[PDB]
A and B are shown apart, each in its own frame.
Chain A
């Protein structure tokens, strides 16, 4: 099935399977980060946790969440080396978009760029395939809520309930029958299920300082980085 250097580079097997980027699928589990995303009717929620080695860990560098523009923001998983560079590439694509085009970005074409970028790097195996997973939200008129996730395989897909990571198989499988059905989605309802899906694998109910939770609703379209005060207000609101 392997001829020469095939095992170490990217070509197609007898079945046409890639050997290198399937290692990139297990390249996400470094650090044990789990990011879940629940997009409601008028809102979209992101939830992620962190690991703290000791008290010297800085609270300013805690945030793993990234913000594309004032309207739209991102969340990354896997090795942080590929995530910080791929986010800076999203900064370059968004700044060049507003420059030459001069209007709002659908966030769909940004995910088209990153999907082709990670694919072009998957093409030639002499540069690192960049197996980091790209997850965003979106805000656009007349389309309601927008959430898009650019996978390292080179394609972009995202919807109301979508997530990627190590333990997302369990949680999202529960979110299959849990989300719909008929269930209507408010602000505190989408954030609640964002906690319950974390309570499926973990159920630690730890203080809000550990989670990194973004949320964006459409009243003022600008996304805001959350403060632990309002999450603590939602933590006592989810305890019955």
Chain B
């Protein structure tokens, strides 16, 4: 499959009053190392991010095309976009090609423009919506990602244990499969302020 070329796992773990998202730093081809610089998470709008896992062309395509539609939205009316309209906007573009569909695993981690309510969603390449308050992940390993959330993650968590849990999550899970590694970048956002942390893996 094409999803085994670039790979990548975007882990968005929501806390109590805040939402966090994390992704691997490594960008390369299969097991051959290239560079850790490329970040698969991109900032979109104000107090909102999006994770992407898949073909880097479609990843940057969603980055530039969402920036297109979002700029038209914010430049028409100055109101900040709501996450529900954003998800319907993402599922719209992914459904525009039924027989031509691109390869991506969009994961949106954002806040509420009006209030402190966080948001999480993970859609397939055809834009299958999932709206929950717990967590959203898209990546390679099926057993490891959701398995660490079942073994650790709880509905009510503070940012201290949120980063520590997602740390060992990105450790005991991502390090299982060699296609993702070489460091992990973490983005935790809340109405108060935005915080960004990073991690480290083996350099082999």
Do any beta carbons of A and B sit within 8 angstroms of each other in the complex?
A: no
A contact residues vs B (CB 8 Å cutoff): none
B contact residues vs A (CB 8 Å cutoff): none
